[PDB]
């Protein structure tokens, strides 16, 4: 009410000292302003004092409110004495009290009954205003602040004396908005004590820029921290401010520690040899039950990073493919392919465009059926899968509406995830979450479909080029999510780093001119598959070639 | 000597600034991978460097005589040529000369002409010495390895992916001096990406590749250019080095935040204690000089980013003895009949309004002034740490660090070695502030300089005159802790009541009356205890602050 700043910005050239400051001060509010030197504190006070106007935005004083400012070079009436300066702060009441005392000392030398009537009117007016308590408060203030002798000329006074006189005048003018720039300057400790006890009961609102911590703990109701033009309000006094700031630091530090462990795992992986990489992948293949038991302890996730919630427990039979033949019209895509998918296995599917990878996905899910052979999926298996071409029939639904179904929390198996954070983890941050599904780019639709795939509880995750439109950071996040996932996953991707980092197996197209539909099943990652391919077929035939059919 | 230079480059579309004062110089043959989230500005940088767009401000210059090629989201292809024809157009004149050589070769088969023989020989000289016959072979190798469409297909029927592959092949065979790739792994299978990476590793020209393909960034890039909201951050090294640097700077930031959190929690714990409990740390000092001295005189490492006071010589039982001190100037007395003993490990807070004799008391203790009556005795074990409050220095060009360090990077002060740069940094002179000349220092900067000069003298009795001046709350706590761990005595003049309560074992307070204007009181306890005792002794009105006569 008493003052409002809306998108206020203040700059002198390249230095931005106020940056979209938007604050609303309730009447009588006590704010202490803190921040390093050059943060912008005195500029805020000067704008609120009406000495400065912002370059952009609205800086508005409540109409009918009064303002007073204490600044480094305080303005004093140089043609008036100390007591005169301090008296000038108070308005009409001081002139009427001086007139009352004048008529009082006039009625002893002279008399007039109309002077008595004037005195009765003045007494009523001043009693209705508590004028004599104001003169008493003037004397108490001048005494407690160690003001100079009340009849001294203010031109000869030093900076400290002038500052004390200005502070006294300002305190007695009692503005509705009181602005103090380092008020404890040139005050002794007991004077600071008195000033603090006085301003604690002060009626108006106060903006005090000070490093005096007892002042900030005993006077401030809000702590306004300024830093390079941004303003961070903290509700409470100085101690509450300490508590809240320490908590914000602790939270940010926990997040940074998570990121630290993930960055260190990525560095350790890239620096490791092939022996340790095969050790790690086969070890993953040998520890499904331990990981599942551990992961089934969690029942909620604060989705700061991508995490894949554990699904149902898996049996030994996951996916069994036996002599699979599959094609369309006269062109065969797969001929006589057989493999068994082990528990905790990550399969990388690789091959050129149009050879049958998505067709294999659809045969596994059962939207397509084999022309020969068998694809058996265990009764214990639950699929997480979205069609790559998934399109929404309602174009008006926003990304968050599509993923969350309107709910603040998403159930994924036994795990609860906050929907806003979940959708944010896939690159939809802020207003991107409100973008309608009908106007999504190809990459936005890809990330939407990935989020839709992973919110399905399951132990077999099917991913079709999930690296699309992800940055390197989110790539590492998805890698970590897969490395901590207890179920199985089949992944189509051209990202070789991802394949080497996560896959225990490779299923690769190796079609020939004679047989376009041969595939090879390999235990190991992409680099091991390529080396084995060179060893198996020779370097010239392991090289990529254009496909003909 | 620089294939491309950007100087103060700026790009904006209305008010949205997408490139902001980018200043980069790319040397010929440089391999840069460009990373960053969507909308950071990567494609805009590529278009500027390709000459497709010009910046609003600044210099964006391709080296004269150099060639540039760009792979963009909608690559332009000339529909009037076939796949092979489009890809051949990239090589240009050399391909036309080789086609002429083959034309003459198949012309000499139906009829001969000796003019054809000399033309063939002349062609052979240029094609063998300044060209390579294998250029057509590598053209076919690229079309095969990138899995281009059939070499004889019209490019009108091609899909977006086939068009992309044809464009990439054409671009690779045009061999520009600056090669710009915007998401080059798009529409490539993993084996095609492997071939592209191995091909670009041996590529002669310079490459700017915007890609999230981390094996590319690790095996091709020599620099990692990270873009963020129009800002450009170059990191020297490949992807592994980039990860290393990111993790280490994150670790540094985390240690910084943990330091700040610990200071916040320790300060909160102190303020949340009762009035008695706040005194515990300072009161413990009075019974533990010998333990504290034994600890401080053991050699350990020290965090010199916090305030540190090197321990001085050991103190005897007699520190400072003042007996019936009378002191004044002209006919005005400042101190009358003051007697006190300073205990070892004692910290004395001197309080009183301006001009009552605090600095003169300091000067009597140090001996710059002598008593008018009484005695001030300083123990034979005492070494004073003190600088005059008005210290300025006659050489204005000497910098802050030059003044403090006397030119030494490491200073011996007793048994302690201090790094001068970190030491002076602890007092708020960070970075280029340390090189600021002494003649242009503000009042607060000069106060902090004088404090840093005071604490490096290695005495066991420290005299500080308003040392809180121009210190932020963090450095205030740092100075507090430094004093609480110091094996010796300190006498401190200050108006900061938080400081006094946290550090003082004694208070020396001015208590002048109308009858005796030079009366002082010595009290065992901190500021708050002194005030409570003052009310107990004098009454509420006489304990209140008053004007000095
Ligand atoms: N009238 C002005 N002209 C140029 N620069 C100014 C002006 N007023 C303030 N500044 C600059 O703005 C920054 C913030 O100043 P100020 O608000 O006084 O900082 P503090 O937080 O120390 O009060 C400072 O670096 C100062 O140099
Ligand atoms: N329903 C269908 N009917 C006929 N042919 C199809 C059908 N679906 C896909 N195909 C053909 O199968 C080939 C490969 O399909 P797909 O597996 O989707 O490609 P990719 O191998 O890139 O995943 C394509 O050339 C396409 O023409
Ligand atoms: N012609 C344009 N008009 C307005 N804004 C544009 C234009 N081109 C690019 N931008 C803006 O510039 C920002 C970054 O552009 P760009 O370099 O294309 O993204 P990226 O770095 O992901 O390739 C985007 O937020 C985009 O909105
Ligand atoms: N050398 C001197 N000659 C005359 N008067 C002095 C001298 N030094 C100090 N004074 C006076 O003694 C009083 C106390 O000075 P000082 O102890 O510096 O005050 P404070 O306690 O505020 O530091 C001041 O009013 C000052 O004018
Ligand atoms: Mg200021
Ligand atoms: Mg597909
Ligand atoms: Mg782009
Ligand atoms: Mg002084």
Numbering used by the authors:
A (entry chain B): 4 to 552
B (entry chain A): 3 to 551
Copy text from the publication.
EttA, energy-dependent translational throttle A, is a ribosomal factor that gates ribosome entry into the translation elongation cycle. Here we present the cryo-electron microscopy (cryo-EM) structures of EttA from Mycobacterium tuberculosis (Mtb), referred to as MtbEttA, in complex with the Mtb 70S ribosome initiation complex (70SIC) at the pre-hydrolysis (ADPNP) and transition (ADP-VO4) states, and the crystal structure of MtbEttA alone in the post-hydrolysis (ADP) state. We observe that MtbEttA binds the E-site of the Mtb 70SIC, remodeling the P-site tRNA and the ribosomal intersubunit bridge B7a during the ribosomal ratcheting. MtbEttA has a conserved ABC-F architecture with two tandem NBDs, an arm domain, PtIM, and a basic C-terminal tail.
Based on our result, MtbEttA in the ADP state did not form a stable complex with the ribosome. Therefore, we co-crystalized MtbEttA with ADP and determined its X-ray crystal structure at 2.9 Å resolution. In the crystal, the asymmetric unit of MtbEttA-ADP consists of a domain-swapped dimer, similar to that in the crystal structure of nucleotide-free EcoEttA. In the crystal structure of the post-hydrolysis state of MtbEttA, one ADP molecule and a Mg2+ ion are clearly resolved in each of the four NBSs in the domain-swapped dimer. To measure the conformational difference, we align the two structures of MtbEttA in the post-hydrolysis (ADP) state and the Trans_R0 state based on the NBD1. We observe a ~40o rotation of NBD2 away from NBD1 in the post-hydrolysis state, allowing the formation of two new salt bridges (E199/R499 and R216/E482) between NBD1 and NBD2. In order to evaluate the effects of such a large domain movement of MtbEttA at the post-hydrolysis state, we superimposed the structure of the two NBDs of MtbEttA in the ADP state to the 70SIC-MtbEttA complex in the Trans_R0 state based on NBD1. Clear steric clashes are observed between the NBD2 and arm domain with uS7 and uL1, respectively. This may explain why the ADP-state MtbEttA cannot form a stable complex with the Mtb 70SIC and has to dissociate from the ribosome after ATP hydrolysis.
